[PDB]
């Protein structure tokens, strides 16, 4: 029924700094800044050191509690990347 | 605190006027009472031995003592009945302290997910697991 699988980790290099305050994430860089919200079941966001590691542990787990962990992993890396690299969007037409 | 103690029920078939020394049958059943142990003692012999509770006598039912209270693993080969897929067996390896404890969780798991209750449930091989 219920089990545990693993833990999720992200490294935070120079040029990017992440907080943990009110369990929310602040990521800044040298090309832009962005902050948002990533709450979910058993998903308590705690950043260990200021520039060491973004860790998000859950203690319970099932198909739904575990199909929601690594989406914050999909939504924390692009915080750290967009503040340094950024992704451009292009649009075309025809006539 | 876990109900459903473990009973050691043994019995001949009222010797005999025919065979004069029928083979003794012993088996261990988890039950709330011993009246419920004998009730399910005379269901195995009525089926697995074709012996009635009338034409036989219970030799010595007994309460198994215990194991030194310490956590360990348990795989309980359990066989239930239901209109929900009639007569399926199962394994459902539990991790409780005593055999009484784990088989309790076995019943409270089947009645939880298959709604199969005490009399629709046979048990076999309540053993332990090292790893």
């Amino acid at each position: 029924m219920v089990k545990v699988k693993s833990l999720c980790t992200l490294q935070i290099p120079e040029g990017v700094t992440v907080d943990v305050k009110g369990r929310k994430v602040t990521v800044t860089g040298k090309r832009g800044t962005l902050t948002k919200d990533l709450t979910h079941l058993q998903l308590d966001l705690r950043v260990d050191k200021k520039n060491r590691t973004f860790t998000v542990i859950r203690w319970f787990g099932s198909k739904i509690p575990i199909a929601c962990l690594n989406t914050t992993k999909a939504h924390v890396q692009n915080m750290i990347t967009g503040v340094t690299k950024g992704y451009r969007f292009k649009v075309r037409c025809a006539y | 605190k876990p109900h459903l103690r473990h009973y050691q029920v043994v019995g001949r078939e009222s010797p005999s006027e025919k065979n004069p020394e029928p083979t003794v049958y012993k088996f261990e059943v988890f039950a709330p009472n011993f009246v419920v142990a004998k009730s399910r003692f005379w269901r195995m012999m009525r089926v697995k031995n074709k012996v009635k509770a009338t034409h036989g006598d219970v030799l010595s039912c007994k309460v198994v003592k215990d194991a030194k209270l310490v956590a360990r693993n348990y795989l309980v080969d359990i066989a239930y009945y239901s209109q929900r897929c009639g007569y399926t067996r199962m394994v459902k390896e539990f991790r409780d302290v005593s055999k009484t404890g784990a088989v309790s969780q076995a019943y409270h798991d089947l009645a939880s997910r298959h709604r199969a209750r005490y009399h629709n449930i046979e048990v076999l091989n309540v053993k332990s697991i090292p790893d």
Partner: protein, 149 residues
């Protein structure tokens, strides 16, 4: 209520049994009945002359009358709130000498002959032994039971 004749609803009742048909016994002709003994009024067919009504078939009762070739049998009939001692007149072949008392005919025959043997008699030969009591039973084959599928 279209048909209620003297022989209604009695196909299987008067029908002879399987592979035993034909003439009645020579025992049933050589029986000996008195006024007073008991008789099973088991109406057999293949005689078809003197069979009683259906009702009096599993019934046993006193012989109040023994004519030359007709036994007269009283039989209790629970009519509605009382039983009638019916007085049926059948022939002998529809009659067995009823065992129904060998249960104590043969009991008090040897039961007294040994109560006398136990009271005065000549000697008291030991009889049937006790039935239900305890015992330290020694097994001869162990076993268990889990399942067979």
């Amino acid at each position: 209520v279209h048909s209620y004749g003297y022989k209604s609803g009695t196909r299987h009742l008067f029908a002879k049994k399987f592979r035993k048909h034909g003439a009645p016994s020579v025992s049933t002709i050589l029986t000996n009945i008195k006024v007073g003994d008991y008789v099973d009024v088991v109406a057999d067919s293949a005689v078809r002359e003197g069979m009683p009504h259906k009702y009096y078939h599993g019934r046993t009762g006193i012989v109040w009358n023994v004519t030359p070739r007709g036994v007269g049998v009283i039989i209790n009939k629970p009519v509605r709130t009382r039983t009638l001692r019916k007085r049926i007149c059948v022939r002998f072949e529809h009659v067995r000498k009823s065992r129904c008392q060998e249960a104590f005919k043969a009991k008090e025959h040897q039961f007294q002959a040994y109560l006398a043997a136990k009271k005065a008699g000549k000697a008291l030969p030991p009889l049937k032994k006790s039935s239900r009591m305890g015992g330290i039973v020694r097994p001869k084959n162990v076993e268990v039971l889990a399942r067979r599928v």
